[PDB]
């Protein structure tokens, strides 16, 4: 049993907020309940709604006049809605069910709400030298630069390096972009000859990009 | 986020800790609590249900007990893995679900001192008119640490961003990294560019520098 929020994106004041649940491995009528759960950047876990086996529904109270969850039989799937959005409203939501004891959660997806616009990163090689060598261990990383909204996901070379891997919280510049770093320690020894390739992919602007990461002549 | 818990709680690799989830009448007392671990980049995961059970897939390192308006979750044998934030979970009077605002678990471990790595801006980046240069601080602990960028020894205030990992799941660690940016007119106006890096774990400040052109 799986479920799958639809991937993460950016709101603009006062529109409404759609998400999607598809549900995997398990009929959605069969389940006790289908339900949402959001969670604001550095908070706690807040309840929204959820959707009983009869098809009743019950939100929170203080979201109730904003908020719809409805399933779709036919593609197996609930959804939810939230019109009238704010600032106030960008969070990690996660969806969530009980089948048959805990409940089967989503992977979550963050929703961003500003009245700022969809911008793809550029990626930057962290290159590797002697100023990032310390004995037989060598330094070297992406700079993924100037995107919004969060989030970015990053990788190293198709998954298959994963030791050693530090990616690094964004951090909100001054011109209301992103920027993060991703680094990982390899063998210096392992420079001239292993390809090191940092995956990066940005889902609300659909960008995707593979950067090999050469080392620096010093 | 109704319920009160501790914003964090520590402990060894093999100690134990508690974290205490403080309700009140209509949620905690009257109903089950239960307990979830939401590792970074996670959904939260169930340890325990209605007040003491645990689910298949949980080892009996975690408990969980209740008394009157407050529940407590029990985690011994502490594992590295265990870094995580822990949230307490129960229902209101009217049933609907509530949580706890959540507790950070940091694994206290020996000092460590910092690697430090820097980085000069790419020729790409410098083609677009920008200059961002990143310094490296790798596997320390504990988690402060001082990060000073100076460019010809003027010593930049205000000029830099930085951002710390969550504890690394292997060794217990933290990471930092500091970007400088400047424009690629004031990046050439300047010659020696440096990070300066003071820990717990060094007897002395750390320093590293380039000079621009040399790569």
């Known amino acids: 049993v799986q479920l799958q929020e639809s991937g993460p994106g950016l709101v603009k004041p006062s529109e409404t907020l759609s998400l999607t649940c598809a549900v995997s491995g398990y009929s959605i009528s069969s389940g006790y309940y289908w339900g949402w759960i959001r969670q604001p950047p550095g908070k706690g876990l807040e309840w929204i709604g959820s959707i009983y086996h009869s098809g009743s529904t019950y939100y929170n109270p203080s979201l109730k006049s904003r908020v719809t969850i409805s399933v779709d039989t036919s593609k197996n799937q609930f959804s939810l809605k939230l019109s009238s959005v704010t600032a106030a409203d960008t969070a990690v939501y996660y969806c969530?069910?009980?089948?048959?004891?805990?409940?089967?959660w989503g992977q979550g997806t963050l929703t961003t709400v500003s009245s700022a616009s969809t911008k793809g990163p550029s990626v930057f090689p962290l290159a590797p030298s002697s100023k990032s060598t310390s004995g037989g261990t060598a330094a070297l990383g992406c700079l993924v630069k100037d995107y919004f909204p969060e989030p970015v996901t990053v990788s190293w070379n198709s998954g298959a390096l994963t030791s050693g891997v530090h990616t690094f919280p964004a951090v909100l510049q001054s011109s209301g972009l992103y920027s993060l770093s991703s680094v990982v320690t390899v063998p210096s020894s392992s420079l001239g000859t292993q390809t090191y390739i940092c995956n990066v992919n940005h889902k609300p602007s659909n960008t995707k990009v593979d950067k090999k990461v050469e080392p620096k002549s010093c | 986020s109704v319920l009160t818990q501790p914003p964090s709680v520590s402990a060894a690799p093999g100690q134990k800790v508690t974290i205490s989830c403080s309700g009140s009448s209509s949620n905690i007392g009257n109903n089950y609590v239960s307990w979830y671990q939401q590792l970074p980049g996670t959904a939260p995961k169930k340890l325990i249900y209605?007040?003491?059970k645990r689910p298949s897939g949980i080892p009996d390192r975690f408990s969980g007990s209740k008394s009157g308006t407050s529940a407590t979750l029990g985690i011994t044998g502490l594992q590295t893995g265990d870094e995580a934030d822990y949230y307490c979970?129960?229902?209101?009077?009217?049933?609907?679900?509530?949580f706890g605002g959540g507790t950070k678990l940091e694994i206290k471990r020996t000092v460590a001192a910092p690697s430090v790595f820097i980085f000069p801006p790419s020729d790409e980046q410098l083609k677009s008119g920008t200059a961002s240069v990143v310094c490296l601080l790798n596997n320390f602990y504990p988690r402060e640490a001082k990060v000073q960028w100076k460019v010809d020894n003027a010593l930049q205030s205000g000029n830099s961003q930085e951002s710390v990992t969550e504890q690394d799941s292997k060794d217990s660690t933290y990471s930092l990294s500091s970007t400088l940016t400047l424009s690629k007119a004031d990046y050439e106006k300047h010659k020696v560019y440096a990070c300066e890096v003071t820990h717990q774990g060094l007897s002395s400040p750390v320093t590293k520098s380039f000079n621009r052109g040399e790569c």
């Open positions: 979970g129960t229902w209101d009077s009217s049933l609907n679900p509530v």
């Open positions: 209605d007040n003491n």
């Open positions: 969530a069910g009980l089948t048959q004891n805990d409940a089967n």
